[model samples]
Target: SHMNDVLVDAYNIAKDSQHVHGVHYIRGRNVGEDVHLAINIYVDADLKVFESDLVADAIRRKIEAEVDHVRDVHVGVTPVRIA
Candidate 1:
């Protein structure tokens, strides 16, 4: 019940970020209990720079502020390092 709202809000924000940033590769899945929602964000190699802990935090914070039902926001970011 509560999680439904969280999922909706989180997805929208995360998805929007991907689109606005032209990443088109930022995707994630919802997993974990109602108390703790885990969102794993996957970024493509080309989008590594744009995707970071700070961006993840913004997404999480956005979801939290927008969705009152969501308690905590966990955004796992995977960056592709390059030389």
Candidate 2:
């Protein structure tokens, strides 16, 4: 119940960051009674994958700091080239 709220808040903040084009999805599982999050994000062509990784880490940290139950975070960045 609380974990769902954490995930939702995390997703919104990640989307609101303006660093990412969009948050494709957010999912997670419980490990040792803590949350392990998986986030899929859409990124612009100009943003390097490494840069995206950094952004993801920032996002993860933000969530981790905001929520007590967050144990880990994994972000997947997918490039979205405009037409």
Candidate 3:
């Protein structure tokens, strides 16, 4: 129904995570034609010292439950780690 379920999955995760954690939503459009979504998640020492990769991995997994067209999910680390 959508352009691709993968895109929807990514958008949902970004939206849901923002709602749950009160984080701002960040987005970057396609460069040439390759579709991808990047969400900057907020984390703190209370949550985990440095487990962004783990958190993103969990999000990817959760997205699988929402859709099956996702081929792969890529997450990146940012220096905006919270204390």
The numbered model that scores best in lDDT is 2
Candidate 2 wrongly placed segments (more than 4 Å): none
lDDT of 2 by residue, 1-83 (tens): 56887688778778876578888888978777788888888888777767887888887778777766777777777788855
Please provide, for model 1 over 1-83, each residue's C-alpha lDDT reduced to its tens digit, 9 standing for 90 to 100. Answer: 55666666667787766513322332333435444556666555465455466677787788777865566567776544333
Question: Which pairs clash inside model 2?
Answer: none
Give each model's whole-structure lDDT. 0.59, 0.79, 0.53
Q: Report the Cα lDDT for residue 18, model 2.
A: 55
> What would the C-alpha RMSD of candidate 3 be, to one decimal place?
4.7
For candidate 1, list the clashing residue pairs, or say none: none
Poorest 10 consecutive residues by lDDT, candidate 2 = 1-10
Worst 10 residues of 3 by lDDT: 18-27
RMSD for all candidates, in order, please.
Answer: 5.5, 1.8, 4.7
Q: Sum up the clashes in candidate 3.
A: 0
Considering only N, C-alpha and C atoms within 3 Å, which residue pairs clash in candidate 3?
none
lDDT of 2 at 16: 78
Give lDDT tens digits, candidate 3, residues 1-83: 33365565676675465213433454444544444455555554355534656776777667656645444455443444343
